[PDB]
Write a protein that binds this ligand. Structure first.
Ligand SMILES: *[C@@H]1O[C@H](CO)[C@@H](O[C@@H]2O[C@H](CO)[C@@H](O)[C@H](O)[C@H]2NC(C)=O)[C@H](O)[C@H]1NC(C)=O
Ligand SMILES: *[C@@H]1O[C@H](CO)[C@@H](O[C@@H]2O[C@H](CO)[C@@H](O)[C@H](O)[C@H]2NC(C)=O)[C@H](O)[C@H]1NC(C)=O
Ligand SMILES: *[C@@H]1O[C@H](CO)[C@@H](O)[C@H](O)[C@H]1NC(C)=O
Ligand SMILES: *[C@@H]1O[C@H](CO)[C@@H](O)[C@H](O)[C@H]1NC(C)=O
Lengths: 105, 99
């Protein structure tokens, strides 16, 4: 039903037939980014829960697949699996802990 | 000396028209669909092609079938070897049996 990601449709009657008006979702403006499958942090590998790791040259964020929305990489949106010696392309970056400023204060 | 049936069909008024798309233009479409799938995934079927590494879009496709993506990244070489052996077996099956 249409080209792109389908959202709705509407039927219209026609002589000896039917007419559909498919409403779709088409992405428009694209930008290159530097990506990585995992992040090495304290001897642990962090994979994104929903989304993809990207970088703007200096810092590293996590971003959903179909839209650009960078977020600070914490332990809420990542999960740990294994070590850093088995994944090809794992980079070195820190992962924020939300409990540390609450424990310090 | 040995006359074929094509000349009998030919002289009795039964002709065969050639296709509009030759076999070279079908292979160009097939090559475009192959190079769009490998280098972009399913993003060239919706809008414009968005590049993504292959070892990452296969981790996108284990997430569709219900497997977490660490299974790919911890077993990438095994899956690559299995796919290469499967393509070799497809070659052997197509070059051995004509049925
Ligand atoms: C990549 O993004 C980060 C996060 O927005 C940028 O870091 C901040 O940049 C602003 C603007 O220069 C500064 O005021 C901040 O001090 C920076 N740090 C933080 C922690 O917010 C970074 O500059 C971006 N890099 C590029 C090349 O665009
Ligand atoms: C899962 O099955 C695969 C078979 O495709 C196993 O891979 C083989 O493992 C043996 C171990 O003795 C090797 O000799 C073969 O060369 C492997 N086949 C390849 C690389 O194509 C794999 O070990 C199994 N996983 C387990 C048992 O955890
Ligand atoms: C990304 O980099 C390639 C490298 O040549 C370039 O052709 C392209 O215009 C860049 N931008 C986008 C949005 O793909
Ligand atoms: C990440 O840090 C470890 C030591 O903490 C180091 O051995 C490794 O080489 C670093 N990664 C890269 C890509 O340099």
């Amino acid at each position: 039903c249409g080209k792109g990601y389908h959202l709705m449709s509407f039927p219209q009657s026609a002589p000896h037939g039917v007419v559909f008006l498919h409403v779709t979702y088409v992405p428009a403006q694209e930008k290159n980014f530097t990506t990585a499958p995992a992040i090495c942090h304290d001897g642990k590998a962090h994979f994104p829960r929903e989304g993809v790791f990207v970088s703007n040259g200096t810092h590293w964020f996590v971003t959903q697949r179909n839209f650009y929305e960078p977020q600070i990489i914490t332990t809420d949106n990542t999960f740990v699996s294994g070590n850093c010696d088995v994944v090809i392309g794992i980079v070195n970056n820190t992962v924020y802990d939300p409990l540390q400023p609450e424990l310090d204060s | 000396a040995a006359r074929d049936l094509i000349c009998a069909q030919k002289f009795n008024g039964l002709t065969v028209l050639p296709p509009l798309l030759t076999d070279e233009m079908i292979a160009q479409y097939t090559s475009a669909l192959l190079a769009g799938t490998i280098t972009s995934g399913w993003t060239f079927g919706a809008g414009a092609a968005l590049q993504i590494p292959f070892a990452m879009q296969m981790a996108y496709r284990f997430n569709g079938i219900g497997v977490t993506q660490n299974v790919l990244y911890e077993n990438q070489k095994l899956i690559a070897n299995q796919f290469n052996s499967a393509i070799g077996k497809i070659q052997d099956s197509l070059s051995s049996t004509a049925s």
